[PDB]
Amino acid sequence: YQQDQVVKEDNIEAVGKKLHEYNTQFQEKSREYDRLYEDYTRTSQEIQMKRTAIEAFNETIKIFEEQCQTQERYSKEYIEKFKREGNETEIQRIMHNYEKLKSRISEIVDSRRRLEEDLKKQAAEYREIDKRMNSIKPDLIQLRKTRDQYLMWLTQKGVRQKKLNEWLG
Amino acid sequence: NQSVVVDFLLPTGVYLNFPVSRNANLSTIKQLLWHRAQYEPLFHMLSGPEAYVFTCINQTAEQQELEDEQRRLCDVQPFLPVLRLVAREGDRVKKLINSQISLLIGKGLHEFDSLCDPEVNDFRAKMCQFCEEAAARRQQLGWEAWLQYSFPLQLEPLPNRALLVNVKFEGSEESFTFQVSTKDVPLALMACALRKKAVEQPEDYTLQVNGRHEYLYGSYPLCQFQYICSCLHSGLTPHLTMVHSSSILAMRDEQSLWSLEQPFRIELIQGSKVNADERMKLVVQAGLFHGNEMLCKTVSSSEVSVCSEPVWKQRLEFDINICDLPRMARLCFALYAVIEKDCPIAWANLMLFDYKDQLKTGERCLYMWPSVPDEKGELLNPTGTVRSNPNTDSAAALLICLPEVAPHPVYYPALEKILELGRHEEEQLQLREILERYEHEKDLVWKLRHEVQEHFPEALARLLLVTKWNKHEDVAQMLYLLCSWPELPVLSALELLDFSFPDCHVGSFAIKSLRKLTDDELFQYLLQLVQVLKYESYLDCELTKFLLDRALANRKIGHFLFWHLRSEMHVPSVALRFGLILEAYCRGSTHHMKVLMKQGEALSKLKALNDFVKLSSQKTPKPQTKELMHLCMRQEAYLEALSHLQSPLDPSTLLAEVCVEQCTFMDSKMKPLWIMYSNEEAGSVGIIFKNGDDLRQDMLTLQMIQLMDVLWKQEGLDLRMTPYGCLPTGDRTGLIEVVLRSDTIANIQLNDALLNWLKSKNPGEALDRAIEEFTLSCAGYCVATYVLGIGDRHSDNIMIRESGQLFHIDFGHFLGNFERVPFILTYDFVHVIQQGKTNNSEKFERFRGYCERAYTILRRHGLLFLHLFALMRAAGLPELSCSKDIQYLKDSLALGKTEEEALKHFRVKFNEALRESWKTKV
């Protein structure tokens, strides 16, 4: 007066054939998952690298912003002191040099922006990887549970380890 | 391209842009800069080049003042080629050390500040101050004590014959060869050498082993030293040097709650960044834990529909009061995706109390880790880390809220208040029977808790587990006993470090019993102690302090500590914990820090060299690839980085000059580089750099074979083992020691045949030694591989030394994983053991006796192997994850049987392997 309806087949060879099929399905799904987990781990590391590379872009630009602060504070005296005693060339050199500095900042801002775009894109991949992993987990876990139910059934029935091995291998 | 355009920022605000060479050092670059700055405005206001340092943003995103101007630009590796001139200003010593640490540990120090975590800031503060104090205190001490810190003695764990020794002095071509006994103490050897012609005193000297940083000193005989012992066995003459005490100074000189009967509950608010099947629905299961054990039943959410930002706003209540919650109480979440009416998505653990003993209140945002599917599919993951996921921007997270339990905050009571609730036969026979080898048993042990303390002190571990940590009265009564508990042997303390014993008072007691370790013995378990840190709840803890103490007192322990931690800095779950320990160590080890820098830079270049060889091996055949590797090695920055460094595998070994011609790569899957060295101070050392594959498996196995050898030698049984060096250094990156004058059994047989090889390497008299060397090592490695369950044993992964010693390589598989690996004797090995004869009962019986004696000795130390393997479950090795993997050792060492029973089973297994040896060969 008890019950458990789980195994679809009820003769030893048929159950063993379906043990061999379900185990193959499981091993292949495990490899599928493992492949994705490599991609997950790798993409986590690449995203970390890109995120510290952005910090390195900030810190560079911060150094360039300080240079502009200095140039503006420091030049005040020499531009005024070279306006009198008409050395208007030295003024023009200071400012052209300062325009050369500002122009370089824009290149570094551009290259930071390109890396932000890559990180935006790679952050989406990471989520897509994590989603695909999560859709695989049920199949993988179901396939593990089935594999074990079939093994237990054949063990209970008293099938020798030699036959269980060849279905698994 | 060879040259690089570099941006220069001058302190007047002026900016220059011009190409320099990647190979140019910063001093050269400052010359070129000054020559160009001449013809740009405001030059006349600058000071001289020596008034300024170059600053750059480095690879780890921090500013770095570049003080060493002999450094090449390509070695500096600034993020972008930008150099700013700043003043040579302030405390340049702190700045320089901060910079070098970040590069050395592969994590910027600013990332510790970025967290705004009081626990992290407090840890850095306390531990750096502690490490610095040790370092200054060390600098005061004498040359002999400093020598002991820097170059501790390498000793063996007893005949009295005589043999000669070559002794020289420092800075002198001429040397003296003369006779000396094996049982002489090195002071006597010095005084003898000191009689050079017929001024100086022999106690002002030490004996260096020339070619290496190994030294002979102290109250021990010559034979106990590994160098002399090695020379005596091989037959060679020791070559030593007499170094003066002043010459060592030259090295040295480098500078309330229990009232709260309210039930425990939490507010589950929102999920975030979730990635799931929209057809399914989401559920959060929650549970409270203390170690493995649950404290109450595990409550769940209602099924909310799948989206990125699922909202619950539920009140999750639990079947336990706040006053019942133990110190190390652990709230554990798992996000699940289910059919509405199963997929574990992610998980996150959280300590209810903080690092300062305060019960937490308010909003926590737990960034979750993804669940992996596995055999023992538990609902929650209480064994997993409490540290948050450091991918805060992308990873899925849960918002929760601990309610306001009281107006003023509440702490866990102190020891003094805990000891208040502390002072408050058939049974004797029943208790003994239980502890001489369940729920009725648990209640009896608890009732007789005072009897266990008095009569079964080693049963402390059993008693901790029976204690009901979900009742605060039991908790306090247990702690009372624990605080007066008698000190336990090292073996018992190793068990108490396991995750089953989370309470800090148990942790503190376990460390207290491990303070009696010697550095030799501590070194044998250092790997396991490093893994146990992953079970820790709080950053500041007794085990970290302990490991830092020993590392600062012993430079060898600090070397292998550094690398064990350094090699997992890529792993997010330990990056923070490990990174802070490395920082602290570095601050108390500014000397060794410079040696470890040199090693890291070589390992950085070997990576780039290996990557090149991988990609080129697909393009062209081996001879041309080998040559192109050499051309890459010839480069100045490469050659200098690879040359003249202490070996990561053994810091007393000196890797001096690379032999680029002898360098190559091996024909294996990951194409590991074969780098050979030579030192004219000496001893032709070789290393294998392997990248792409994991080496943690091989290290653990080699650590365990080495442990077996030490265990056997302690019974006067030297089985002539070869536990070569193996060390993980980074992400799927490590080094392997090359063993000279050895070859795989496959290669020897391809070119009867095994015995011919030994004849050609040991002609005449010597052959008898070679067969004995083989017999001894064959016995040891037969037992070793049987006990550890190491299969896949074939001619390509078994090697033999020209001395005769057999040894195994490449231990990818162990504990039966890929079922019980049988004991295995090979017909070819039995042939060599029997001296080529068909029957040699005399020789073969001795060999059986060696195997039996070896096996017997390991059973006596079986619990050590069990406990050490139990702590390695922390490491996350695929083939070592659960009790079944540990159960393998229990059965392979037959610990459930008596010594008489086990030996009878070993003999049967031995006998069947011999019968199978004939069958396998046909």
Ligand SMILES: CC(C)n1ncnc1-c1cn2c(n1)-c1ccc(O[C@@H](C)C(N)=O)cc1OCC2
């Ligand atoms: C195959 C390799 C990368 N590997 N993988 C996992 N363990 C090893 C590994 C470990 N050892 C070695 N290889 C090794 C190889 C070659 C060798 O000598 C040269 C002359 C040879 N016979 O070609 C000496 C050696 O020293 C023993 C230690």
